[PDB]
Design a protein around this nucleic acid. Sequence first.
RNA 1: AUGUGGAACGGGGUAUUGUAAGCAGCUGCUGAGAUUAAGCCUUUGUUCCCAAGAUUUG
RNA 2: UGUCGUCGCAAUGGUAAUUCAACUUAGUACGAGAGGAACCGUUGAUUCAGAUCAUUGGUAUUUGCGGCUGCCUGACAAGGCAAUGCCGCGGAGCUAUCAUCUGCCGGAUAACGGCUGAACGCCUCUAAGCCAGAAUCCGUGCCAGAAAGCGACGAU
RNA 3: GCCAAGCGCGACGUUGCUUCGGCUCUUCCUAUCAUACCGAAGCAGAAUUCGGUAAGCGU
RNA 4: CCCACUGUCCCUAUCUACUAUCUA
RNA 5: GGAAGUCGGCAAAAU
Lengths: 335, 223, 132, 17, 101, 35
Amino acid sequence: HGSLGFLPRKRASRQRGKVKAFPKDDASKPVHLTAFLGYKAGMTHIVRDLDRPGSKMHKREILEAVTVIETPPMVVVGVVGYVETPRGLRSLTTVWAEHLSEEVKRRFYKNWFKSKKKAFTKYAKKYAESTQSINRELERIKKYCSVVRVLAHTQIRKTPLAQKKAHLMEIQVNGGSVADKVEWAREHFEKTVDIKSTFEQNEMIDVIGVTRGKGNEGNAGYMHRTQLNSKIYRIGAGDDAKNASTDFDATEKRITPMGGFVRYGVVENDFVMLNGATPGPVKRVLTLRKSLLTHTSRKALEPVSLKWIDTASKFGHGRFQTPAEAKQFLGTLKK
Amino acid sequence: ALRAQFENSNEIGVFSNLTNSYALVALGGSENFYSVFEAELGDVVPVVHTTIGGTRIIGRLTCGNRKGLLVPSSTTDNELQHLRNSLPDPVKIQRVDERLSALGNIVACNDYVALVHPDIERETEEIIADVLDVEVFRQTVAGNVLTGSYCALSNQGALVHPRTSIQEQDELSSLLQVPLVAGTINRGSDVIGAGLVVNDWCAFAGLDTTATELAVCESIFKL
Amino acid sequence: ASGTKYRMTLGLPVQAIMNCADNSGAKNLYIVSVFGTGARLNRLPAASCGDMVLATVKKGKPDLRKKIMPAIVVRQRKAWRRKDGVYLYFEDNAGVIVNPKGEMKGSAITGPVAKECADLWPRIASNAGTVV
Amino acid sequence: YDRMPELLDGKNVADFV
Amino acid sequence: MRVHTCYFCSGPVYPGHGIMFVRNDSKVFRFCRSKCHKNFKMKRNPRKVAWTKAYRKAHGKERNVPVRYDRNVIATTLNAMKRVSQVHAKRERLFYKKRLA
Amino acid sequence: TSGPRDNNRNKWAKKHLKKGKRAKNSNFSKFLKKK
RNA sequence: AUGUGGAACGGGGUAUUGUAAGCAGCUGCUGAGAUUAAGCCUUUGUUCCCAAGAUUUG
RNA sequence: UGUCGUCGCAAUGGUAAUUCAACUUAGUACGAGAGGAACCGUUGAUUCAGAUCAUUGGUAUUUGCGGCUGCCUGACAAGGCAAUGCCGCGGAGCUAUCAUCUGCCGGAUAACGGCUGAACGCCUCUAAGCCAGAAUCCGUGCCAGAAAGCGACGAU
RNA sequence: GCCAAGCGCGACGUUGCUUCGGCUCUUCCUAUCAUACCGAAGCAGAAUUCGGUAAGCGU
RNA sequence: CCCACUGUCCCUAUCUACUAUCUA
RNA sequence: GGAAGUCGGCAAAAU
């Protein structure tokens, strides 16, 4: 058999990979976030210069397989205050935003269509009527609670996914005093937080998610897993047309490979490219978290400058990055 | 004669190539070898720490003289651009598409006369004559096709394998128009070119080269 | 040897007849054991390009046979992926008859030479004819 | 100190300049 | 970074893609895919193979000197590359129209 | 070789936290924070 | 439980195979034709469908 | 536990990483010479563990395409066939140390080396006390979540 | 046998002489082969030898 | 003993039918 | 790769 630290080998009790540990809080650092939620689209292979001192491929180039995760900006819909107790952390109270998008309202219902859409109705009414209760609760969190987690949901509509329920979750707000975290959450109420503001493509992060099920084996598969030290290679912007165009390559193109991502679609929003494989198949939600413990060796610290990113047809033996140059080489078709 | 050893190898000629106008050192290894080379020739001729074909065998892969240099066809486009940028404009750099890419191990060339391997291509010989501007002779050293590896050629003298006949050594010396000595370097290492590199005014030998070998090289090169 | 060597696809296990590429007169080389093998249960030791193993001269001259002595593999039939991403496979499995110090016993080598093997063994690169 | 595009639009700019 | 041309299909071969094969003559064959690698294996002549560029070429159907870096030269080369491709596309379209006629 | 719980290795990890880490990561968080 | 809704087909993209039937004098129409979700992508294309039954619940 | 649902808390249980040689420090410390270290830092490789399918190989009921043999429609063609007749290629999927990624930090100690210091007006690492210190121990991290442990929240 | 603290024995010392049998497998013990750290030795260095803690991890 | 051959093995992987399973 | 498997070319493919 395998390692005894992973048994009992049973199905994960959650579709979305839940964070089990957040980086330790620091008052010296100002107020920011630590985790983000994305959707796996697939991976390609890229050619990257190797600036690895002491290595035998120093000042050379290697080919690396890199997973692409679409990460549309996340909407902060609430905040949760946690108070330390002799029996552990306890959720003291929760404050939600006044207006919640249908994407996050669909989470509370198994049948949103048959529902009367009554979620947060009186909550929105009391929010508009009197703000003294909201002020009392926020003052309660900043005075008593020691850990602050913002409720954020993903804009699943932008992703080419048939699912319309947003994966609501909590992001621990590490940095500054408790009042600073509360002020940060209130300012960011109803707004959007971007992965460009959270991660910046040169740090060492961990990816967590549920693996894909292999059926029945002599149970094997569909288990919660935590990959450590997955390096971000590029946080590409969806709007920019140079997202998949490096400086050594030009050739204006998009990260979505020609022919589309297999069983996922076309990536149009901000995407994240991580070195190596990540758990879960395509179209499954993955969670990203910062480094709990600081460890930047040369591999985790060296800068990265991509040279060429493959966008060939992953469906089948693709042999052309873009239909433009495909038509330039291939003879003119009958159509 | 200067004693140096790249990493833990006494075959300095494998990891580096020496000419009368420029020097090349391996990339990705230890900077001590490059510093040692720069300490003796940095202020005289340029030294480029580059690689050919993504390997540290550039010394035995690249062959040339003070006028021009030749690189194997396996050299990358970026590598060739880096070499041209580092090397002076008067130092011509040309790529050779030969069946034996080991130019340094097949052909030994001086500033005036060059000896190539017996199976060198006519186009390669024409390119060598055009670039290096030297007379190319298709012969063999000590009966071995690897003339560039078994023989060391320079402007003031040449070194060959000690097993060669006296008449053969005299014929090679007359053909090369320079003195020739049949000896060994690095304590019996028969690959003189791999074990030692000699320029017009200086020579570099491995750390395992004996005192008698160093004295013989100094007498032959008159350095 | 000198320098590190990357993980490589293993395709020359024990009990393998393997071509001799040197000029020493040997024709066939017989793999007996692989140097630097781990304590892996029911795993046959295997060799790849640039790896030096114990080999015996099966066909050659009488004096080089019957000696359990090192040989370096220079060509590999099985396709391997180099870290640059390209895939290489050679027609045959060629080897060079080498002393345990790492010095070429012969004077000339026939056939192409793997670039990793020429880089790994400086003497092999010195005596190599072509390295592609 | 500045970099140059090695290959663009399916053509090696370095090899065609 | 060189995007090579396959021996058999004569199409663009990119890093990672395809297979590389070296002959005892030190000649190197690059294959754009397994199909073209296999097609070399039983030794089909590209010019007889219908979908190869060599067939489409010979049937009527269709720098070793390093250069010093120059920003102006690179910009001029990049600008001229698009125009050259556009001219080639127009010529191919006219050739296709002539072939259809 | 020593394991990851080697007491000296933990000591050297602590020493290198304030040498090749920490400050360059704190301001790195600050930059995307003010963003 | 009426919507960037769904499903049937269809178009396009993309892929696999290797130039189709048929016509004319091996060649041309023909890298055409065929297949393409059955666990590929996309759809201002066409048609159809749904604003329900039963059960349980303070 | 009103009911349903979302987001979480963590009592407790399990645990995981192993070993090697290469660079530098070096031909220095040391040595008549012969020889020749080590710490920090760095790169790779074995064994194991958890994943993944960009690329590569394998796989063929995609009975997807093409070719061949034979059979049946009087002929041409046209088709259809043949327990999956035979051959080549073959997506998709599965899969491969035959392909690729990743594998963590704190204290407390043993051996042992000490500090202060009596017992015993000296002394003493020990008696009261206190440091340094093993791949050990206990945590962290990782997996499970009490199906009779619990919190916050939404609606009614 | 000689002594022989002592209680006729008499300790430590001293004189002579010479059917079973083995593959896989699971864990477990340490009475430790390797890995980690120490102590000693004419232990210069390197390579060792002996002796401790030590079953985490292999064998 | 030599040569050839092969999933016996390194080291297993994929496909097919039947079985196996559920329903009356 | 080719009997390294197992007490062993047992069964397959080769012919």
